[PDB]
Amino acid sequence: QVINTNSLSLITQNNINKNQSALSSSIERLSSGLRINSAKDDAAGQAI
């Protein structure tokens, strides 16, 4: 009922950006072939 703010594209974009991280992690883990590529994934397993 208002055009100055969509009020829905914002939520949709937030959801898309949330899914983007999982998509990127999956794509990286496919090519790497290793579970923990960086300490961001599991800093505890890196030392082990």
Binding site: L10, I11, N14, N17, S38, A39, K40, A43, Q46, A47
Partner: protein
């Protein structure tokens, strides 16, 4: 409305800054991973030189390779930089404005890493010889692992920060 728009713009800028900090942390982690690989290779070389079946020239060659690896470690430690500021040569902290308001930030502990800080300077397997070589190497590797882990949680923290910030901008 003025207060609301000021808050929204500040939050967007803070999210951008947090992403920049994530990039910095990732670069530093890559440098640390390179140093770690070099340390693992030099540890294997020390395990090789530990036995007594090798002749003196073999110890000399192993020591030359060890010294080359140490020089490479020092080089990648000193020459690494991101956006004009070094990462592995200064013991300061990196403060990232993520709260969109005065004061509140997130700190990144940067430690000066080189052949001296890690110890085992003048390793000298050939000559004299280090008292406990494998012990010092494991100590250096443990220090590298501690730095990576302490830096590893930072980007997860910053991702949580940017997610919460996006939610806050949406609601505002």
């Amino acid at each position: 409305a003025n207060r609301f728009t000021s808050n929204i713009k500040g939050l967007t800028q803070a999210a951008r800054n947090a992403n920049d900090g994530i990039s910095v942390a990732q670069t530093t982690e890559g440098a640390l991973s390179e140093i770690n690989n070099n340390l693992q290779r030099i540890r294997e070389l020390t395990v090789q030189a530990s036995t007594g079946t090798n002749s003196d020239s073999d110890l000399d060659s192993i020591q030359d390779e060890i010294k080359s690896r140490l020089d490479e470690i020092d080089r990648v430690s000193g020459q690494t930089q991101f956006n004009g500021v070094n990462v592995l040569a200064k013991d300061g902290s990196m403060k990232i404005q993520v709260g969109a308001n005065d004061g509140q930030t997130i700190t990144i502990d940067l430690k000066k890493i080189d052949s001296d800080t890690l110890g085992l300077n003048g390793f000298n397997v050939n000559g004299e010889s280090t008292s406990d070589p494998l012990a010092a190497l494991d100590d250096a590797i443990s220090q590298i692992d501690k730095f990576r882990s302490s830096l590893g949680a930072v980007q997860n923290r910053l991702d949580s920060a940017v997610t919460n910030l996006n939610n806050t901008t949406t609601n505002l």
